[PDB]
């Protein structure tokens, strides 16, 4: 009866091992769809097709390019360079630890006002913070733009230097409230240019000329002069040239990664639907895929490959094959010929971008594939619904196993009594 | 057969899209006629090259119920639908335009 119950187990244990391999297959399927979804979403960015690269003739001017630039040639002439105001105290001090302000007042405040910032910056010095090092540390810890330094002009004499940021909107109007000696030491007014601190450097704006247009920025990093190219100025160049040329490398690599991900998904599905033909046909072969004949893989394949013909896209191309990617006859795998894809990316970049990326909401091959894979990979999707149905059947089977195990106990007792 | 016929679907979609507009020129359309011969060979491969139970059932149609496995009273009614050019109307597919 142990052998009889093992024969009873034969399809029961076969189904239990099949359910274990089916849970493994579901895990592998979810992992493959996760990787495919990651690659597909990586492709879903339209900014890859609008990409360029810029070069400059002069080593002084530095050029970089963001997304959305336009190809061409620009003649840059830099006339001025931005500078940052620096204020230095007049009275040199013996040591950096000697007290600067009056020790009678335990609380004082440094108030710095600029045209740039709207709320004036207040830095609070409590008792014992009237040393030069303490003022330096307070102003550097505020981290609001002003940068205090110390200069040793010669042995036993020091100065305090406060430097703002670049531009004419960052001129300082310093004040000290709560103290008198410190107010006598640190007090400037850039509106009337009169104060108790000398001005070592004068604030200036950065002026330049791009293709006959006069640009005036605050800092030496110009951003929106052609709206897509960032320029870093170092010296006063004259008639420098910047060349911006279209690029397709990022889009090409995204396409390669996407086709590789789809090929890996198809390979995993094909291996999961594996079968071996046996001539006698007495029983099913050992090398059988657990998810063979199930609606899961077939439905996923049909749904994914149906999106390659998308009616949402309004571009000139209606079939993805026109980009230069063809699906092989033997198996559902995609392969790319370099010439056609390169020509399409070079000439019809807009058409390819509209075909793949689409408007991002209800248009494009990639958007439809993304939403379909999201719906399938979700728990409410048909794939996880079938998985839950299988799990419920397995739970009912487990109850059946417990009942039949009670039957095993009864039958074992019966034959023990007989034998 | 489904892989071959979906490849054919993508082919014919490209064919109609390129023939409707001026993107595909008439020398390109002669190359498309070469592709039409190639996809006819594709149909011939899905029909003849593949085989069922040692026989080219995808090349010859036998719409008959299979013999009973003796495990059940009822017989399995398999209506074997071969992927043929003629009976399914696929042979009539030819999108070559007028010269």
């Amino acid at each position: 009866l142990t052998k009889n119950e093992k024969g009873r187990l034969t399809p029961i244990t076969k189904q239990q091992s099949a359910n274990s391999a089916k849970l493994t297959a579901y895990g592998t399927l979810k992992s493959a769809l996760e990787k495919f979804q990651t690659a597909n979403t990586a492709l879903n960015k339209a900014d890859l097709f609008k990409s360029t690269v810029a070069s400059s003739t002069t080593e002084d001017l530095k050029v970089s390019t963001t997304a959305g630039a336009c190809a061409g040639t620009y003649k840059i002439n830099v006339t001025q360079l931005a500078a940052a105001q620096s204020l230095a105290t007049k009275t040199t001090f013996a040591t950096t630890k000697e007290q600067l302000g009056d020790t009678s007042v335990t609380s004082r405040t440094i108030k710095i006002e600029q045209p740039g910032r709207k709320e004036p910056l207040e830095i609070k010095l409590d008792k014992g913070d009237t040393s030069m090092e303490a003022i330096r540390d307070a102003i550097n810890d505020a981290d609001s733009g002003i940068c205090a330094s110390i200069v040793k002009v010669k042995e036993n004499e020091f100065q305090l230097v406060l430097t703002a940021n670049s531009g004419t909107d960052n001129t300082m109007k310093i004040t000290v409230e709560g103290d008198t000696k410190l107010n006598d030491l640190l007090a400037y007014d850039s509106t009337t240019n009169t104060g108790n601190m000398q001005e070592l450097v004068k604030a200036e704006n950065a002026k330049l000329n791009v293709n006959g247009i006069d640009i005036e920025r605050q800092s030496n990093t110009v951003t929106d002069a052609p709206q897509g190219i960032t320029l870093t100025l170092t010296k006063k160049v004259t008639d420098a040239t910047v060349t911006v040329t279209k690029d397709d490398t990022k889009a090409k690599e995204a396409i390669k990664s996407w086709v590789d991900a789809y090929n890996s998904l198809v390979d995993t599905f094909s291996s999961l639907t594996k079968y071996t033909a046996v001539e006698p046909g007495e029983e099913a072969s050992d090398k059988n895929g657990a998810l063979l004949g199930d609606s899961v893989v077939r439905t996923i394949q049909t749904g994914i490959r149906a999106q390659f013909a998308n009616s949402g896209s309004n571009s000139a191309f209606k079939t993805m094959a026109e980009i230069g990617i063809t699906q092989d006859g033997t198996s559902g795998k995609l392969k790319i010929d370099d010439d056609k894809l390169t020509k399409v990316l070079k000439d019809n970049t807009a058409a390819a971008r509209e075909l793949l990326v689409g408007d991002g909401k209800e248009t494009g091959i990639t958007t439809k594939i993304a939403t379909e894979v999201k719906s399938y990979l979700a728990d409410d999707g048909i794939i996880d619904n079938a998985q839950d149905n299988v799990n419920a059947t397995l739970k009912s089977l487990t109850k059946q196993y417990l009942s039949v195990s009670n039957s095993i106990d009864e039958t074992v007792a019966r034959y023990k009594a007989q034998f | 057969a489904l892989n071959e016929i979906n490849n054919n679907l993508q082919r014919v979609r490209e064919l109609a899209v390129q023939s409707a507009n001026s993107t595909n020129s008439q020398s390109d359309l002669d190359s498309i006629q070469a592709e039409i011969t190639q996809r006819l060979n594709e149909i011939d491969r899905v029909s003849g090259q593949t085989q069922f139970n040692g026989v080219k059932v995808l090349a010859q149609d036998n719409t008959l119920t299979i013999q009973v496995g003796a495990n059940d009273g009822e017989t399995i009614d398999i209506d074997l639908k071969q992927i043929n050019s003629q009976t399914l109307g696929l042979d009539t597919l030819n999108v070559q335009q007028k010269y």
Partner: peptide, 27 residues
């Protein structure tokens, strides 16, 4: 047709093996 009929037929093969197990209990 083929796939769903033969999935139900794999279930029916399990049922037939269950009947054979019942016969083994009978034998």
């Amino acid at each position: 047709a083929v796939q769903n009929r033969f999935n139900s037929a794999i279930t029916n093969l399990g049922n037939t093996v269950n009947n054979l197990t019942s016969a083994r209990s009978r034998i």
